[PDB]
Design an enzyme around this catalytic site. Structure first.
Site, PDB file in Angstrom:
ATOM      1  N   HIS A 151      -1.664   0.514  -5.276  1.00  0.00           N
ATOM      2  CA  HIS A 151      -1.615  -0.824  -4.706  1.00  0.00           C
ATOM      3  C   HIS A 151      -0.733  -1.682  -5.597  1.00  0.00           C
ATOM      4  CE1 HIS A 151      -5.578  -0.715  -2.140  1.00  0.00           C
ATOM      5  NE2 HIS A 151      -4.726   0.243  -1.827  1.00  0.00           N
TER       6      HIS A 151
ATOM      7  N   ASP B 183       0.845  -1.188   0.000  1.00  0.00           N
ATOM      8  CA  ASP B 183       0.000   0.000   0.000  1.00  0.00           C
ATOM      9  C   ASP B 183       0.883   1.241   0.000  1.00  0.00           C
ATOM     10  OD1 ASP B 183      -2.451   1.579   0.292  1.00  0.00           O
ATOM     11  OD2 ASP B 183      -1.797   1.882   2.367  1.00  0.00           O
TER      12      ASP B 183
ATOM     13  N   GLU C 238       2.586   0.693   3.395  1.00  0.00           N
ATOM     14  CA  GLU C 238       2.050  -0.407   4.185  1.00  0.00           C
ATOM     15  C   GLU C 238       2.266  -1.720   3.445  1.00  0.00           C
ATOM     16  OE1 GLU C 238      -1.540  -0.171   6.539  1.00  0.00           O
ATOM     17  OE2 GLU C 238      -1.936   1.846   5.763  1.00  0.00           O
TER      18      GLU C 238
END
Ligand code: DTP
Ligand code: MG
Ligand code: MG
Length: 280
Positions: A116, A79, A140
């Site tokens: 993403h 992420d 992330e």
């Protein structure tokens, strides 16, 4: 019909780990596609296949599709937040360099300012899940435990999940080596958890009133009061500013331990011995 054309979506469609999600104020809560209930990330029968996610997306008017990541599936979810400008091009050098070393399925996140990346591999065991950067961007990395929204907006024609070595992620993520959250949940249930300071409030006066409550619930454990204060809506940079051979936070916590006389005992559960009333 449109998203199933993507090769990476076909790879994800082999798994009955699909959910739908909706915007709650400013969060993305996932939902069971079959009954509309709130979906957990650990209950497999709370998910569905892609056909059930697409049907529930229309049934309950959700914002989009989601995919729960599990340890058993070979997918890693990367992420990247706040790395695309208005024109949906990469503006962060760390995100540009990462895309050059991890060329897998890349899509534009729902808000349009993020990316993403879905890869097949294993995460390094010495990196943090979330890493924030000065400009405001974040990274992330998750291989299980949570879900990811699926938009299908393929970025740079990267529409295929590749099997790549992910040891290169150590160059981008920060390294890492009663309970605290038990005390926090306790204080929240007693109305002893403060809110963010409104304009016109004396913030340092709120710090002392909250440090006074921490001295009781944490049993005057100064190292525990400090760990809890840093997770509270009252944390700021002044907490660690030096002040006369100490920090403003250390002095605030030591004055609370002196001012407060009784403590909360987890064995006695003397919740009634608290001298401070709940907030409004
Ligand atoms: N409140 C929540 N509860 C459970 N899972 C969540 C929640 N919010 C987000 N997630 C999951 C799905 C997201 O893809 C993933 C990353 O979070 P976030 O970056 O905040 O949303 P996003 O990646 O879906 O779009 P964008 O970053 O453009 O807003 O974590
Ligand atoms: Mg994001
Ligand atoms: Mg996985």
């Amino acid at each position: 019909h449109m998203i199933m054309e993507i090769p990476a979506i076909k790879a994800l469609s082999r798994y009955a780990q699909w959910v739908i999600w909706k915007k709650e104020r400013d969060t993305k809560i996932p939902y069971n596609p079959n009954n509309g209930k709130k979906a957990s990330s650990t209950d497999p029968l709370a998910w569905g296949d892609i056909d059930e996610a697409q049907a529930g997306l229309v049934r309950y008017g959700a914002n989009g599709l989601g995919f729960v990541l599990t340890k058993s599936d070979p997918f890693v979810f990367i992420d990247l937040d706040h790395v695309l400008d208005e024109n949906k091009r990469v503006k962060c050098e760390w995100a540009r360099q990462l895309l050059k070393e991890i060329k897998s399925y890349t899509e534009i996140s729902p808000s349009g300012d993020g990316l993403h990346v879905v890869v097949s591999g294993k995460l390094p065991d010495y990196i943090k899940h979330k890493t924030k950067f000065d400009d405001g961007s974040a990274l992330e990395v998750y291989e299980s435990g949570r879900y990811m929204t699926i938009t299908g907006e393929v970025f740079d024609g990267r529409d295929d999940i590749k099997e790549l070595d992910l040891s290169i992620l150590g160059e981008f993520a920060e390294h890492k080596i009663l309970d605290d959250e038990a005390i926090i949940d306790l204080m929240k249930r007693k109305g002893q958890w403060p809110d963010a300071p409104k304009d016109g409030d004396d913030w340092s006066s709120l710090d002392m009133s909250f440090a006074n409550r921490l001295a009781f619930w944490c049993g005057k454990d100064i190292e525990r009061m400090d760990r809890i204060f840093r997770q509270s809506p009252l944390m700021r940079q002044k907490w660690d500013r030096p002040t006369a051979g100490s920090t403003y936070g250390r002095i605030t916590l030591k004055k609370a331990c002196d001012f407060v006389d009784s403590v909360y005992d987890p064995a006695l559960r003397n919740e009634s011995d608290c001298p401070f009333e709940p907030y409004n």
